[PDB]
Amino acid sequence: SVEEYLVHALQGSVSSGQAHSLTSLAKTWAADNEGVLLTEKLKPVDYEYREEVHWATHGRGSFGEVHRMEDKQTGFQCAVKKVRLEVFRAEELMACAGLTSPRIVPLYGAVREGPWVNIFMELLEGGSLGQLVKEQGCLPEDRALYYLGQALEGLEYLHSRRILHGDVKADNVLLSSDGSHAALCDFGHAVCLQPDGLGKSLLTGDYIPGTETHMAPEVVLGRSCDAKVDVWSSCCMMLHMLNGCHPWTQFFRGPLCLKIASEPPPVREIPPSCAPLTAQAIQEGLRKEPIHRVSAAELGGKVNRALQQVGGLKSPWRGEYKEP
């Protein structure tokens, strides 16, 4: 209404503004150079911010969609996620913009150029939790608990704001230079939960999930979904971290969605040598029925206690190769 008059003003130009503008503009895209930049270090020139003209590229995502970039005026280096326009979802920015949490990769701005949405964000120097698991087969339990713990703090943030990530997994967790900090990214599968708590459903075409192996049973059953899907995924992530491979992967080859539906939870993939409280945390996080599944916050507590049970975090950042 007033947002309509507003967006028309924002269109056709790249400006330095706030998150609300970006969000509003974003909705436009989800339905020629324009956008909003949320940091001083990324500076438009004369209403424009074009690739190879104002900023240059220097690929690491599921789609090789993410690059190191540099602003040609300012010298500042960050990351660009290229997303095609016809596929773009405002929830990528909605579940991201102005979210002041150290567990969520900060958004630096987003700029449309032609059929491309260029999403700018902090470049975290230590890469993805996924790459870390690849490099060193699997992670020590305490290290595994540590990162799950930090991902849960980030999800607790999202959920309390009525936001569901949609695709929680090691590849979508990023790490600082020392590996001390972990923060969520890729909100491409994020959904905004409407006033009535739980929402959408995969079959209606609103919650399109990201990674099959990490997908909760209520998703596959075409049931209504809430934040609880993230909690299931985060434990699939936990299994990935502990075993050096996704759930279901080592056992079933074909349409997993049908297996996830009717099998017991991947609970059998829990390493026998794990601390009982770690096993319990995963077990509670992998309850097939969402209502009885613990919340991110509830799991955070159990995870926190389990880390203490294993003598705290005393594993080196990078050292041992631990065979899958």
Q: Which residues are catalytic?
A: 167
Indicate the residue among 21 and 172 with the shorter CB distance to Mg ion: 172
Our CA dihedral for 315, 322, 215, 232, rounded to 10 degrees, sits at -30
Tell me how far apart the alpha carbons of residues 50 and 35 are, in angstroms, rounded to a whole number. 11
CA dihedral (49, 53, 58, 60) positive or negative: positive
Does the annotation place 64 within a ligand binding site? yes
CB 33 within 8 A of CB 117: no
Q: Does 61 bind Mg ion (CB under 5 A)?
A: yes
DSSP-assigned beta bridge partners for residue 110? 36, 119
Indicate the residue among 71 and 186 with the shorter CB distance to Mg ion: 186
Indicate the residue among 81 and 287 with the shorter CB distance to Mg ion: 81
Indicate the residue among 212 and 298 with the shorter CB distance to Mg ion: 212
The CB-nearest residue to Mg ion is: 186
Q: Rounded to the nearest whole angstrom, what is the least distance from the CB of residue 63 to Mg ion in the complex?
A: 8
Q: Does 142 bind Mg ion (CB under 5 A)?
A: no
Residues 6+ apart with CB under 8 A from 263: none
Residue ranges in the chain assigned as alpha helix (H): 2-10, 19-29, 91-94, 129-135, 141-160, 217-220, 228-243, 256-262, 276-285, 296-309
Q: Which of residues 92-121 bind Mg ion (CB under 5 A)?
A: none
Q: Rounded to the nearest whole angstrom, what is the least distance from the CB of residue 236 to Mg ion in the complex?
A: 15
- Using CB under 5 A, pick the residue from 141, 186, 226, 230 that binds Mg ion: 186
Select the span of 182-190, 269-277, 298-306, 316-324 touching Mg ion (CB under 5 A).
182-190
One DSSP character per residue, 44-66 reads -BTTB--BTTTEEE---STTS-E
Q: Which of residues 256-295 bind Mg ion (CB under 5 A)?
A: none
Does the annotation place 60 within a ligand binding site? yes
> In Å, what is the CA distance from 33 to each residue of 10, 45, 75, 293?
11, 12, 21, 45
Q: Does 137 bind Mg ion (CB under 5 A)?
A: no
Does the annotation place 289 within a ligand binding site? no
Does the annotation place 52 within a ligand binding site? no
Does the annotation place 35 within a ligand binding site? no
Residue 263's Cβ-count burial label (10 Å; 0-12, 13-18, 19+) is: middle
For residue 291, the tally of other CB atoms under 10 A from its CB is: 9
Interaction pattern, residues 62-81, with Mg ion; x per rule: CB under 5 A: x-------------------
Select the span of 183-191, 197-205, 221-229, 292-300 touching Mg ion (CB under 5 A).
183-191
Q: Rounded to the nearest whole angstrom, what is the least distance from the CB of residue 232 to Mg ion in the complex?
A: 18
Indicate the residue among 142 and 167 with the shorter CB distance to Mg ion: 167
Select the span of 88-96, 167-175, 240-248, 259-267 touching Mg ion (CB under 5 A).
167-175
Residue 85's Cβ-count burial label (10 Å; 0-12, 13-18, 19+) is: middle
Indicate the residue among 153 and 186 with the shorter CB distance to Mg ion: 186
Tell me how far apart the alpha carbons of residues 50 and 168 are, in angstroms, rounded to a whole number. 31
Numbered residues of the known binding site: 59-66, 81
Applying CB under 5 A, the residues found at the interface with Mg ion are: 61-62, 172, 186
